[PDB]
Design a protein around this ligand. Sequence first.
Ligand SMILES: CNc1nc2c(CC[C@H]3O[C@H](OC)[C@H](OC)[C@@H](OC)[C@@H]3OC)c3nc(N)[nH]c(=O)c3cc2[nH]1
Ligand SMILES: CNc1nc2c(CC[C@H]3O[C@H](OC)[C@H](OC)[C@@H](OC)[C@@H]3OC)c3nc(N)[nH]c(=O)c3cc2[nH]1
Ligand SMILES: [Zn+2]
Ligand SMILES: [Zn+2]
Lengths: 364, 367
Amino acid sequence: DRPRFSFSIAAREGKARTGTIEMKRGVIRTPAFMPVGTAAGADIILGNTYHLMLRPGAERIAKLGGLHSFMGWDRPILTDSGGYQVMSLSSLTKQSEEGVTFKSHLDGSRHMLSPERSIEIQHLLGSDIVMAFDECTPYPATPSRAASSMERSMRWAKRSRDAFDSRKEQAENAALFGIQQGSVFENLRQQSADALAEIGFDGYAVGGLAVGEGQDEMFRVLDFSVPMLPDDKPHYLMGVGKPDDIVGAVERGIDMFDCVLPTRSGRNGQAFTWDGPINIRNARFSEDLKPLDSECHCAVCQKWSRAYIHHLIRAGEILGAMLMTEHNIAFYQQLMQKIRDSISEGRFSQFAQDFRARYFARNS
Amino acid sequence: DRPRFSFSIAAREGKARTGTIEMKRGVIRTPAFMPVGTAARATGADIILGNTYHLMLRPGAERIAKLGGLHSFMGWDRPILTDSGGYQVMSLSSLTKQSEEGVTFKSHLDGSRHMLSPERSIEIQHLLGSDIVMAFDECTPYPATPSRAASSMERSMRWAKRSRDAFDSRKEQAENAALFGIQQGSVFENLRQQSADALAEIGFDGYAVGGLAVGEGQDEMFRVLDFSVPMLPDDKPHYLMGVGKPDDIVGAVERGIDMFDCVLPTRSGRNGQAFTWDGPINIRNARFSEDLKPLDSECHCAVCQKWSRAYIHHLIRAGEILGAMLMTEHNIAFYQQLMQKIRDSISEGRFSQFAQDFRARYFARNS
Ligand SMILES: CNc1nc2c(CC[C@H]3O[C@H](OC)[C@H](OC)[C@@H](OC)[C@@H]3OC)c3nc(N)[nH]c(=O)c3cc2[nH]1
Ligand SMILES: CNc1nc2c(CC[C@H]3O[C@H](OC)[C@H](OC)[C@@H](OC)[C@@H]3OC)c3nc(N)[nH]c(=O)c3cc2[nH]1
Ligand SMILES: [Zn+2]
Ligand SMILES: [Zn+2]
């Protein structure tokens, strides 16, 4: 009944788009924020493949029914390829054209990542959207280093395509995304996009960003990089990001987002609100009887005041960071919905202006 | 078959004791460290703990009861101890209305309101299916004037009697669980003696030393334990709430403590601190980026058989939450290994030597 992977765009404004990705396990409304999944509202959740590879192991995840039964989640699941850990854990890796081997453990165990093995692991995880095994080029990088890195990733992208297509069950029920690299350099971005389009992918991710370059540099790279990708295919900005990062990226053609800030902020005493992020540990909140956000519809905001959460956190009650995290996750979905609504109305440019004016005034 | 609650002392050295607490759900080897339980062997604990105040608010004591109590909630058939809320009475006092009846918390944005009292606290701990129940007390804030410490301790002692009666009013709880009284009095010796006498007049299966590990410092805490622990019944377990660092545990055992709890193993593991026999290490230090050794060369835990300092250092630097999970899993296991070496050394008559050796190696910091 449902298609394997059908991306439809229902409304546009400037470079921004809103629409749906239809898959066998459900519909993904775009622009989308995709939260990190955990072991047992968003349309799709994510699995940290490298993490699951080590704990409890991809084969064990497979034997217990894949990530859908592992996370109690019957809707789509996207998995990364490991290309980010290829960089972020590079000091523990031996890297070559064949792939990436990690340092042997104290028990003899050894893990390796390659275009073939990464697609095999993501298949074992039962993921619905598979990412090519790439390398997230570190920042900053010389044009020479960015070029060799991107070019290797593109050869890895072709191997990921073949490895995905070599498995009948995976090729007929999942989808494959290519990942554009090239650091901040326009000619290399164009090379990667062309190389990805020559191979063919269901969706196209903009990789190698949100690695310390700053929002101004990131927006500048998206300005020329997103229009290099196929316009009739989803655009996924990996690792992004702050709410204002999300809004500006949507302005530049991104349909899919992921990042760990909702949980990382909630564990560090930071809550996202329509008036900007607040540091709940600040003394101004010690007697603030308002919820974290006066408009938020999440469960936390219907029950918990800033004062209560501020004292929970000051008192060492871990429940306080859990409520902050639960609010931040829900706030992110509320942001994406308002984005989708405003594009559908033809008022996205006005929403982005109003969002920024209120988010940066910080009248919390 | 098994008794409700039987504490046996198998060996002693100075004020230190090792032995067993026997309960219907299993044996607790003492001195014991009791880790925080969550929702579902040399590193294994005999009893785990429930944050009653947390569970009261999420998901609720009644809901925990309907799903089979904390034993099925945490997938744990061995004993479970629950706190009473007396610490949150202090730590969240700015959100409370306190009176002789009990402690009422600030109403929520949904109309909901939570209150704690000696009667309701024992009722909640019963609903949680707890095996060891703590009296509803008040952990007196530090510092405190002698006047404030006195009114606080005396209120807690009246609450302790109400906790006893409320515990005894429920036949199933009274026949299958155990009740601990909590000594207060801040750092003041005369008040500690009043609290002990008052608790022993009432009668409890075990006696906790409350109101410590609240910022007084190890030197002050040891000074209070010097006179406070011998005020308690010698043939009953002694539980030091909130303690603590490994060197706090060793010194407390030297002064007669049989039971410990604290969140430092998880709090340290989430902040990049691992406990080792050479003292704590900050895994984030660059010295560990290529350190091929495990966190600790002697540790028998699962992490130390597989994971090097170098790998965990880079996991944490790379933002991989798995790094903090391994640090945490090692810290929890090291804690049980410390308690075992403590129990072994008392049984051998060598605890005083172990304590000297432990401190010499732990503080030299030759990691
Ligand atoms: C922060 N800036 C950021 N993160 C990039 C991730 C990783 C995304 C990944 O980020 C965490 O893993 C580490 C998340 O795990 C907690 C994953 O969610 C499960 C998430 O995978 C979708 C990239 N992944 C690949 N394969 N390639 C990239 O170029 C790339 C760029 C990123 N920038
Ligand atoms: C840090 N110094 C510390 N913690 C004291 C706790 C609470 C222990 C409690 O500490 C966390 O709750 C807050 C733990 O939850 C995460 C509880 O374990 C589940 C644990 O309950 C046994 C005390 N509790 C009572 N009832 N009375 C006390 O006098 C007392 C003294 C403490 N000192
Ligand atoms: Zn909220
Ligand atoms: Zn270990």
